[PDB]
Design a protein around this ligand. Structure first.
Ligand SMILES: Nc1ncnc2c1ncn2[C@@H]1O[C@H](COP(=O)(O)OP(=O)(O)OP(=O)(O)O)[C@@H](O)[C@H]1O
Ligand SMILES: Nc1ncnc2c1ncn2[C@@H]1O[C@H](COP(=O)(O)OP(=O)(O)OP(=O)(O)O)[C@@H](O)[C@H]1O
Ligand SMILES: N[C@H](CO)Cc1ccc(O)cc1
Ligand SMILES: N[C@H](CO)Cc1ccc(O)cc1
Lengths: 427, 427
RNA sequence: GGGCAGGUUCCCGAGCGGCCAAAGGGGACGGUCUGUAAAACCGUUGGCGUAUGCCUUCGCUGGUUCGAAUCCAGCCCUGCCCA
RNA sequence: GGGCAGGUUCCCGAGCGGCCAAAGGGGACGGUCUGUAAAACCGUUGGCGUAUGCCUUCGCUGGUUCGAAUCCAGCCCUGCCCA
């Protein structure tokens, strides 16, 4: 694909690219551009949200450009204020580096690892030794009125909500990473406009070609309103078992399916529109199958498309009705979903042995058992859950909080619609 | 003097000491307290303004405490925003270190140098290696709303006047210097409240006894309104020749004499009040004599008082009329003042030889001569000055801008009331 | 990144095509009155041996016209409103 | 540094001396209806082998009273107004 042609593929599904005429230009230079993308391991594991920007990076690699993944072990220590309406809490450099592990491992599910298209870097490499005098020069490149001109900060300032002064350095620390690696393009979610812009500003200061800001739409999380985030618990991990990933995707609030196909799949608007035709449930089945299938593999395919869907063994014309077809892992997944919907037990449930000592008088109080089992944070809670008709013992809905369970033979504990644990005597 | 007693001597003439009960306490610890006082050599030479805080430091040394003079060669690079209503301009670390020279030399005119009472330090020693991570911790000790709560910043922000973000680090850089040397007390002009307070804040963060902020009144400069400053050209240098120092003090606007005696001398309110009795001119004579006398010496006396005034040979009862009395240097000084008032020539005038080549046709144009002499920035100016009846040749008020001066024998050039230069042929 | 308002001489600031080295105010400098003060008042506030001559100064770099501080073009910087 | 208003449970937030493990709203969790969705509705929202018993939780540390989340004292932190 020639320049003019690449700028298209890339431009598709993208929120905004500014300044676009510069990306079109850089493409014409016939040399691997440097595509930057950082992530602050404040919490482990990546998720479908990240997949939004990562699949895009992948696509840049696919057109021969090099991607540099910046693991913000340092920045993550400071905490990125973008969005947050409250100072993010502190994090030690040892912590962020612990999380980083997951990020490296996991990025691979979407990114290419071939050395000429992928470099890994932790900004703590070049940021710890940034000198006080050097900082002063960065922070002198912008004015107070400009910082406060940010959505996030404005609101907070006006609302009289504390803003730690250090929260103002973050933009610059991120900005530097750009200079650090002469980035041609910095990838990002829309909530990174500001940071990506300060990146251009700081690059000029260091006499470098101002990177091309590439913003991707933000994927909304399972709650329906807020964006997917590791801190909001509304995400679908990139490395959850197919069972889990499949069920969660079956829960993506209806009003979002359109967005999910656009940001997570490669289906033509037409194919999407016709899917919603079949209705909500059917679409979910499809969306779920694709992604559970895709992320099941060691690395997703260059394109999650109608063909890829069919290559699995499904009939696009079947619109999800063809449950039987499909991989012997996505199958069982969708299968577990349905059994549970019906109110049946999942085939494979986690067993958890219970030391005879934990017994008392030969039995064990249901309240405590559910806790010893990790289904309830505590007896009191269990009790409460039971009064609320929320736990089941061997399929039967418990009703006697004082119940004394007999662990002679295994038992199948249950909490809510889909949390199962088989337990037995081991001691 | 016991603690309770010291807290008094010190408290006299001082703007405010906060928190006072802490200084009273520290005094009782019977151990040399650490009195901090920094200065940013943005421009060379100290002046009577500085003398305000320096004489106070001296007094702390006089009661046995140790003074640590911090030469802000680093801070001076950043630029202290206090007061300034516009970002101070940049300064290289090599520059500030050039100026520093003057400051060390000159501080001595007021400060004691005995090692157990005086230490010299350039904060660039401990500030250059302050790490980015370390900075983040300093700037996290305060909120935006608090920075903007400053007189200086508020005004500017509201007034829509640019505030470089780096201007916000200065407080912290100064604050650190406190931690750096476990300062018990930081001295300062009232325009340093904020900085001195952030110093306590930052000390707590580093688990140190929050220093005692000691604010001294600001001495107003010769203009009459604005405070004396190296950047406003309204100062009287601590190391100007007695001639100069004497004449400038004879120009201290009347409405300020009270302040000048209080901040620069050690005369009881009573003595001051009775001086103003004699009237303006007489008081000036006295004020001038004292300080010109005092700063004439290699180091001022512990107290510029009525006794010291008399020890010079003056009659306090004479109220300045006794012009003859006095040192053979302060005498000639006051003498030059008067001759010039009368319109006479000063005895000792600076000569400046003029290379025959500079001649043209045997003469030299008055306009150019005044420039070759350093009395006028340029011919045009000279011409203009002359049209304005502002230059004199040999006592005669020039009137012919095209005049061709004859440098056969010396000539006495003059610009305004008191700028004289004798010039002659040398080549 | 996008919209609008700004960028001019020491500072702030007016600026129209040629009347622009460029209004006014401030500051500062000279001067008068004085006390080598203040106030008031009167001037000055790009440079060149002395000048229908040239250069420097209107954010930068180009261009239009005979002629650009004004106009056009790209870029830089600030405030506000955005994102 | 000084004045005033705040600091309470996952969040925001009411709080009076004992009625406080502490109102209400949000979120979240259970449940009903469903499509393992939404909306609506009904509950839950410190812990302890099962409890006129104790502990943890009202910014920190002390103290008053029989009894403190409420009161007093010093200190910490935030917003506004100051300096
Ligand atoms: N839900 C999302 N949808 C789309 N892109 C996302 C989403 N979350 C994060 N990203 C992108 O991934 C990049 C890395 O995110 P990172 O984890 O560093 O911070 P974050 O925004 O706090 O993440 P989280 O959303 O997990 O809080 C972001 O710069 C953004 O471009
Ligand atoms: N006119 C003055 N009157 C009284 N104290 C002064 C005066 N000028 C400066 N000081 C004091 O001297 C200290 C050192 O001043 P420094 O030269 O570092 O900064 P500055 O305030 O810019 O000085 P300047 O007044 O020369 O601009 C200040 O912290 C202040 O305490
Ligand atoms: N700050 C972004 C969100 O956490 C991630 C990041 C982006 C760019 C970097 O150079 C570093 C981190
Ligand atoms: N910032 C003050 C005025 O210039 C001077 C100063 C005061 C304290 C220091 O630690 C350093 C400099």
């Amino acid at each position: 694909h020639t320049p003019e042609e690449a700028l298209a593929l890339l431009k598709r599904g993208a929120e905004e690219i500014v300044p676009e005429e510069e990306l079109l230009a850089k493409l014409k230079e016939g040399r691997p551009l440097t595509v930057k993308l950082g992530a602050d391991p404040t919490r482990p594991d990546l998720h479908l949200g990240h997949a939004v920007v990562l699949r895009k990076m992948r696509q840049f690699q696919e057109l021969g450009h090099k991607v540099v993944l910046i693991i913000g072990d340092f920045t993550g220590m400071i905490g990125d204020p973008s969005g947050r309406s409250k100072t993010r809490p502190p994090l030690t450099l040892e912590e962020t580096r612990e999380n980083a592990k997951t990020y490296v491992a996991q990025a691979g599910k979407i990114l290419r690892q071939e050395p000429h298209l992928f470099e890994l870097r932790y900004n703590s490499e070049w940021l710890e030794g940034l000198t006080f005098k050097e900082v002063v020069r960065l922070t002198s490149l912008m004015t107070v009125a400009q910082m406060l001109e940010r959505e996030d900060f404005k609101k907070r300032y006006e609302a009289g909500i504390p803003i730690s002064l250090h929260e103002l350095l973050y933009p610059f620390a991120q900005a530097y990473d750009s200079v650090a690696i002469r980035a041609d393009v910095e990838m990002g979610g829309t909530d990174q406009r500001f940071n990506l812009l300060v990146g251009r500003e700081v690059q000029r200061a260091y006499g470098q070609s101002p990177q091309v800001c590439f913003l991707m739409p933000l994927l909304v999380g399972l709650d329906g309103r807020e964006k997917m985030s590791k801190s909001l618990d509304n995400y679908i991990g990139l490395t959850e078992p197919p069972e889990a990933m499949f069920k969660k995707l079956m829960r993506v609030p209806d009003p979002l399916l359109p967005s999910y196909f656009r940001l997570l799949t490669d289906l033509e608007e037409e194919e999407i529109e016709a899917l919603l035709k079949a209705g909500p449930v059917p679409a979910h089945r499809v969306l779920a199958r694709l992604l559970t299938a895709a992320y099941a593999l060691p690395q997703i395919p260059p394109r999650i498309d109608r063909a890829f869907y069919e290559s699995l063994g499904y009939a696009w014309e079947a619109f999800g009705r063809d449950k039987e077809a499909g991989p012997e892992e996505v199958r069982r997944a969708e299968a577990r979903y349905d059994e549970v919907a019906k109110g049946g037990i999942p085939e494979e449930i986690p067993e958890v042995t219970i030391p005879a000592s934990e017994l008392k008088e030969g039995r064990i109080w249901v309240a405590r058992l559910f806790t010893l089992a990790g289904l309830t944070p505590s007896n009191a809670e269990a009790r409460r859950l039971i009064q609320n008709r929320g736990l089941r013992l061997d399929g039967e809905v418990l009703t006697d909080p004082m119940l004394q369970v007999d662990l002679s033979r295994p038992r199948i504990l249950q909490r809510g619609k889909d949390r199962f644990v088989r337990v037995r005597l081991s001691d």
